[PDB]
Design a protein around this nucleic acid. Structure first.
Lengths: 105, 74, 93, 74
DNA sequence: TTTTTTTTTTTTTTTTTTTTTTTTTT
DNA sequence: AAAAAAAAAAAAAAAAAAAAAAAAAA
């Protein structure tokens, strides 16, 4: 079904990420651990999604934005720092978009 | 190497209660980054657990030992 | 100290509740289990408090309301149903 | 048999960062109910663990085995 | 000097553009 | 699995319509 294939796609990506950690840390992950992380990640998306939608809704928006996500990642301070960094970078990638488009000025 | 934007979009839309809800591009980008951090934390914490109990590889037992705190952190 | 008294009050109530469960199910709890639940409850309150305050503040309110609490209890579905029912009941008073 | 409202109020006020913070009467009532559910869950889950491992009473070993999932659930 | 007409100057409404977010197809 | 188009909403300019200032009479 639809969600089965979404789980498989998550498992694939989780496998790649865990492979990178494994190669970096020189310690193997069992196939079972990879599968467990994939399952947890899929399940965690349900909680993320509902919360994000409530945060957006809460501020009378239909589109979830960066502030909602940063709010979601509030829980560990190392995490919060990481995310904000990434956002400004992503915005910097956005500037390039302005450079691409022709400017009347 | 991490999540595609389109993948994360589909995963979230599976679960929205209100079908009206959409995802802005910047928000989607940050979520891609956040999910990577989640997965890498799980992996890295499992490796630390396996090391700590002197295991030859990161088995499910170690992962399970690392889940409680991971979940509180997210 | 202040926190010691609060923990004692929590322990007393936890003891009450566990005693009621014990008498209902005809199985005893050790004194250590009672104490550990009281300790866990005290520690849990730190997490609950900070989250509730962030939920309220995140909506630009200074007073935490029932919606923040129901949001907090979002995690197990039987618990969420339980809570909503109780909210309507309290409102009936 | 459960928590007094005044008790739950004092417990929470111990921990507020901002001393401005107050708690509404209805919110306080719901918290009294929530704390009861938390304690009873811990107790009931411990009993199930003790039963499952065929122990003579609920001991700290069983409680500890039930804590990880309890905490994720709260 | 006052009160509406004619040219320039201003105003709001519709239509079309111009971007933003998600989904399809090879 | 990636890239571009299709779908939908947003935003800007062009067209239309009225009044003020300046001119012209009674």
């Amino acid at each position: 079904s639809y969600q089965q294939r979404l789980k498989a796609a998550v498992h694939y990506t989780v496998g790649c990420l865990c492979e990178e950690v494994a190669l970096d840390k020189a310690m193997q992950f069992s196939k079972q651990t990879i599968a467990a992380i994939s399952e947890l990640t899929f399940r965690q998306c349900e909680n993320f999604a509902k919360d994000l939608e409530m945060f957006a809704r809460h501020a009378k928006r239909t589109t979830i934005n960066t502030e909602d996500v940063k709010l979601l990642a509030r829980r560990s301070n190392s995490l919060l720092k990481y995310i904000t960094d990434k956002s400004e970078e992503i915005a910097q990638a956005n500037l390039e978009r302005k450079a691409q488009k022709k400017k009347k000025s | 190497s991490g999540f595609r934007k389109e993948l994360v979009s589909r995963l979230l839309h599976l679960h929205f209660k209100d079908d009206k809800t959409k995802v802005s591009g910047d928000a989607l980008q940050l979520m891609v980054e956040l999910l990577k951090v989640f997965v890498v934390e799980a992996a890295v914490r499992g490796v630390r657990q396996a090391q700590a109990e002197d295991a030859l590889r990161v088995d499910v037992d170690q992962l399970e030992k690392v889940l409680p705190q991971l979940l509180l952190d997210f």
